[PDB]
Design a protein around this nucleic acid. Structure first.
Ligand SMILES: [Mg+2]
Ligand SMILES: [Mg+2]
Ligand SMILES: [Mg+2]
Ligand SMILES: [Mg+2]
Ligand SMILES: [Mg+2]
Ligand SMILES: [Mg+2]
Ligand SMILES: [Mg+2]
Ligand SMILES: [Mg+2]
Ligand SMILES: [Mg+2]
Ligand SMILES: [Mg+2]
Ligand SMILES: [Mg+2]
Ligand SMILES: [Mg+2]
Ligand SMILES: [Mg+2]
Ligand SMILES: [Mg+2]
Ligand SMILES: [Mg+2]
Ligand SMILES: [Mg+2]
Ligand SMILES: [Mg+2]
Ligand SMILES: [Mg+2]
Ligand SMILES: [Mg+2]
Ligand SMILES: [Mg+2]
Ligand SMILES: [Mg+2]
Ligand SMILES: [Mg+2]
Ligand SMILES: [Mg+2]
Ligand SMILES: [Mg+2]
Ligand SMILES: [Mg+2]
Ligand SMILES: [Mg+2]
Ligand SMILES: [Mg+2]
Ligand SMILES: [Mg+2]
Ligand SMILES: [Mg+2]
Ligand SMILES: [Mg+2]
Ligand SMILES: [Mg+2]
Ligand SMILES: [Mg+2]
Ligand SMILES: [Mg+2]
Ligand SMILES: [Mg+2]
Lengths: 177, 51, 76, 136, 116, 67
RNA sequence: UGCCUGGCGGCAGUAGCGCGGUGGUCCCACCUGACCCCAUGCCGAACUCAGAAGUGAAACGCCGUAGCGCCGAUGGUAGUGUGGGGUCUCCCCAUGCGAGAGUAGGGAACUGCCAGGCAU
RNA sequence: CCGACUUACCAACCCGAUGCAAACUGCGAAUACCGGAGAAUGUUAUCACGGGAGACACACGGCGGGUGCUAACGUCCGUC
RNA sequence: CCUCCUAAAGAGUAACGGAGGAGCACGAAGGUUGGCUAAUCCUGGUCGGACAUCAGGAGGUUAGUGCAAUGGCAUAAGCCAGCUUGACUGCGAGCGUGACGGCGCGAGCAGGUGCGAAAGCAGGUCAUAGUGAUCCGGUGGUUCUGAAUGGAAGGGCCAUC
């Protein structure tokens, strides 16, 4: 809750002033975080996909869903229904917790940093972001690794405009370039 | 074409049987549905036998 | 040379028109799908045949938010 | 020649050609060549009339063709009997009813237009006349 | 959207009940309150009605939106109907999935009498 | 949250270089010794430069010292 | 009797959408918890329960406005039943029926039962 | 490694305008057909059952069409 | 044998007329209860590319339907789950379609089932193709018949090849 707490007094009240939100309800809050990691190399061997699953379960604290192709595509030689990736939605206590971790452990282990981008926003205000390796999280143990592997990390928000979001992020001292 | 014919036989020893079809390649499992035997006038087990 | 085929006609359509006096059972329409929908005292068969469920008179009407056509038996 | 790039079907019933036309106004250009009679216009007749009226303005102004031949016409080979299926497609036509503006011109003087359209009309199987825009 | 997703979820049963021409005991529940009414077969005429907004029922209750407010409404209506003239009835979830508060309302009405 | 399908998720302690210590919930299942927290980091702190370009003329006058 | 609001209908775009305002006493919504009843192919998001610190931001209801949708004459034209006729692949005359499109224009729905709150 | 200047030329979606369709339809007749009610008229003209058949090569003309060349005293259907 | 058109707005309607399909498949792809909503483009995002999986927006069925075409389909007949065998036996008011043989639809009765708290629903599948008379034989059943009589053989009847 650290940052849920921080959010509930420090963040809300700053943003409160700098936009002149009359209603408090108007203040952007963070809704949910979701961690995709597609694993096309599944159609080759299915063990790989489950091996991802444990990673994403080890990072995040909860079992991932296993996603399947919506339609068949011949481009990648897949057919509708084969498992090809896995996600976790994070919503509460756990969502704020992982977030805390992301900022204050994971992201300053990025092999050579320059912050993150502040360009990656959808236009409504939901921050999307990749990670090249998965050693970034100390949840995993680097000498017990099969492969280098990545994920998306998408922070879905109640922000209305692209801009208004950025503020919400920054106000948690989010490391933008 | 491929679906064979089979008879399902009452467990109530009456003799009475139904008939149906089956893909044996794909599902080779002696089919055991439960049907109404009218010689004893009660639902009982029926078990796949050969036509 | 590659043509020359056709199927046998199915005599579909309305058998009993608006105002006609019918007996319970009588077929009203034969159709493919529910071009007409069963209304009051009217059943719908497994080939979407509409039939009277009670002696009376046939009645068509348009009703509902989709402007569908319904058939009903007034029990006159 | 003008001809549908593709069609749902190869061959069409004969049909009839009753009625008056839709498209009786000069809509694009200033002058048009309207059809008084009734008949078929073949792709070839359209191309021949088009070339005639182009050449006699020396590529000044702009020509619209309002009609388009989208009806295929079949014929039986020589020395074959009746029956054994429908014939093979040979050429394409447009059905013309009285009133159908056929071509439109713009960007030349009226008296030049007159002489351009008079030539093209000699290439057509249907009686035509010259027409102008109307305010309404 | 919740209400749209709910209304849709109710409509099949709502329509079945029309054709059968049944007096229907129809529920409605929100965070704070639960309601009941019994509608004439035509679907346009209330006969008896009971809820946690009528002061007479509420003044007992510790809270107007729980499984005990339910039982209170699930009795008032059944009394007010059995004393009217209405024994046989059909229950109408109305989207809400027969459980908890909604089911509590219903069970109590089976105790009073209402024969569904 | 469903029962007995998810991994253990518990308190630990995460001691950086700069003495910085933070109780945190994680699977890892024992206390970490990490080396660069959000306080120990050039970028977060404000350190990293951007590589000094445009030295050629400074270089040359530093290197030779000639009239 | 008036004004609000919730539930169930009739009716099924003259009733829908957009654009602009506006409402929290009650109602409704978001909302606050989650060991429990119940729940998630992961997630109290949804469903479910126990509640009332907060806000009407969204949503929802209400009010206004013609940018759209929608409705739409009168007249004329097209067609066509019967009887005549021609220059008969297509038309014309007498009589009966008479569109579609488009034009003027309409239009920001109308209405029943029950309950609740306020005002008189 | 991107670029940058320039388009003598091609043009998707979208927007506005103009057409066409037996196998297109956000429209839609006249007639025809089904059912009900009422007069007048008609040597029951109607339906059922029983005795006896013949016929199952059709032709042209009008109207609506397929085929053919809107050829045929052609050919194939509907209707008088 | 099925679907569309020709076919002239009820049915039906020919040609060596114009176009396409069938000679199956499913113990779930059937029954019921509970729940759910498509295509496609745009924006952002590790490998990841025009196209895989994630998040948001626009969109509103332009998707989907075991297999043709047509008519249907949101209360979905489309998609996912739990439990299950109504892919029941006897019958059937009434009606549709045929020259006939036949084929089709069916509410309700009786017995015994499944799902649902219940109201209810279920006699296969969104519907329309997936088919072969009679004879002569086979298999199982049978309060029938049994050439002097008791049996039996053969015959009938019901189920099926
Ligand atoms: Mg047919
Ligand atoms: Mg049925
Ligand atoms: Mg015609
Ligand atoms: Mg025309
Ligand atoms: Mg909630
Ligand atoms: Mg109009
Ligand atoms: Mg008029
Ligand atoms: Mg009009
Ligand atoms: Mg409005
Ligand atoms: Mg009559
Ligand atoms: Mg009469
Ligand atoms: Mg003969
Ligand atoms: Mg003959
Ligand atoms: Mg002949
Ligand atoms: Mg003849
Ligand atoms: Mg003729
Ligand atoms: Mg002669
Ligand atoms: Mg002849
Ligand atoms: Mg017809
Ligand atoms: Mg006709
Ligand atoms: Mg004939
Ligand atoms: Mg034929
Ligand atoms: Mg199915
Ligand atoms: Mg269902
Ligand atoms: Mg992509
Ligand atoms: Mg989306
Ligand atoms: Mg489609
Ligand atoms: Mg189904
Ligand atoms: Mg009978
Ligand atoms: Mg039970
Ligand atoms: Mg089917
Ligand atoms: Mg023999
Ligand atoms: Mg004997
Ligand atoms: Mg003997």
């Amino acid at each position: 809750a650290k940052l849920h707490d921080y959010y509930k007094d420090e963040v809300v009240k700053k943003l409160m002033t700098e936009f002149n939100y009359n209603s408090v309800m108007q203040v952007p809050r963070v809704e949910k975080i979701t961690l995709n990691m597609g694993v096309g190399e599944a159609i080759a061997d299915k063990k790989l996909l489950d091996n991802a699953a444990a990673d994403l379960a080890a990072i995040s604290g909860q079992k991932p869903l296993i996603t399947k192709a919506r339609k068949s595509v011949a481009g990648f030689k897949i057919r509708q229904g084969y498992p090809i990736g896995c996600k976790v939605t994070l919503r509460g206590e756990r969502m704020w917790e992982f977030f805390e971790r992301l900022i204050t452990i994971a992201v300053p282990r990025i092999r050579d940093f320059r912050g993150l981008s502040a360009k990656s926003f959808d236009g409504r205000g939901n921050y999307s972001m990749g990670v090249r390796e998965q050693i970034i999280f100390p949840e995993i143990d680097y000498d017990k690794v099969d492969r280098v592997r990545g994920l998306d990390i998408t922070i879905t928000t109640t922000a209305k405009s692209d801009e208004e979001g950025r503020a919400l992020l920054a106000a948690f001292d989010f490391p933008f370039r | 074409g491929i679906r064979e014919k089979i008879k399902l036989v009452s467990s109530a020893g009456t003799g009475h049987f139904y008939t149906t079809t089956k893909n044996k390649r794909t599902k080779p499992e002696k089919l055991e549905l439960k049907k109404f035997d009218p010689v004893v006038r009660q639902h009982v087990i029926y078990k796949e036998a050969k036509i | 040379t590659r043509n020359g085929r056709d199927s046998e006609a199915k005599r579909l359509g309305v058998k009993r028109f608006g105002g006609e006096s019918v007996l319970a059972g009588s077929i009203i329409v034969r159709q493919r799908g529910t071009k007409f929908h069963a209304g009051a005292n009217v059943g719908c068969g497994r080939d979407h045949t509409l039939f009277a469920k009670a002696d009376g008179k046939v009645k068509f009407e348009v009703k509902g938010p989709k402007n569908r056509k319904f058939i009903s038996i007034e029990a006159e | 020649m003008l001809q549908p790039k593709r069609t749902k079907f190869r061959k069409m019933h004969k049909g009839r050609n009753r009625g008056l036309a839709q498209g009786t106004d000069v809509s694009f250009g200033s002058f048009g060549l309207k059809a008084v009679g009734r008949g078929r216009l073949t792709a070839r007749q359209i191309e021949a009339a088009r070339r005639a009226m182009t050449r006699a303005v020396k590529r000044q102004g702009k020509i619209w063709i309002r009609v388009f031949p989208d009806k295929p016409i079949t014929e039986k080979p020589l020395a074959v009997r009746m029956g054994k299926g429908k014939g093979n497609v040979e050429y394409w036509v447009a059905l013309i009813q009285p009133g159908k503006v056929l071509y439109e011109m713009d960007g030349v003087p009226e008296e030049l237009a007159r002489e351009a359209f008079k030539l093209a009309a000699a290439k057509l199987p249907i009686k035509t006349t010259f027409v102008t825009k109307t305010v309404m | 959207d919740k209400k749209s997703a709910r209304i849709r979820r109710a409509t099949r049963a709502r329509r079945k009940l029309q054709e059968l021409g049944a007096t229907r005991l129809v529920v409605h529940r929100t965070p704070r309150h639960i309601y009941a009414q019994v509608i004439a077969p035509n679907g346009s005429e209330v006969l008896v009605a009971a809820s946690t907004v009528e002061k007479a029922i509420a003044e007992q209750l510790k809270y107007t939106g729980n499984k005990d407010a339910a039982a209170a409404v699930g009795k008032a209506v059944a009394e007010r109907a059995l004393e009217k003239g209405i024994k046989d009835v059909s229950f109408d979830r109305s989207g809400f999935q027969y459980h908890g508060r909604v089911q509590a309302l219903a069970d109590a009405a089976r105790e009073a009498g209402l024969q569904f | 949250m469903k029962k007995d399908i998810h991994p253990k998720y518990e308190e630990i302690t995460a001691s950086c270089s700069c003495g910085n210590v933070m109780k945190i919930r994680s699977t890892v299942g024992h206390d970490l010794n990490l080396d660069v927290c959000s306080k120990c980091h050039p970028f977060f702190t404000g350190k990293q430069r951007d590589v000094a370009t445009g030295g050629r003329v400074d270089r040359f006058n530093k290197r030779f010292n000639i009239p």
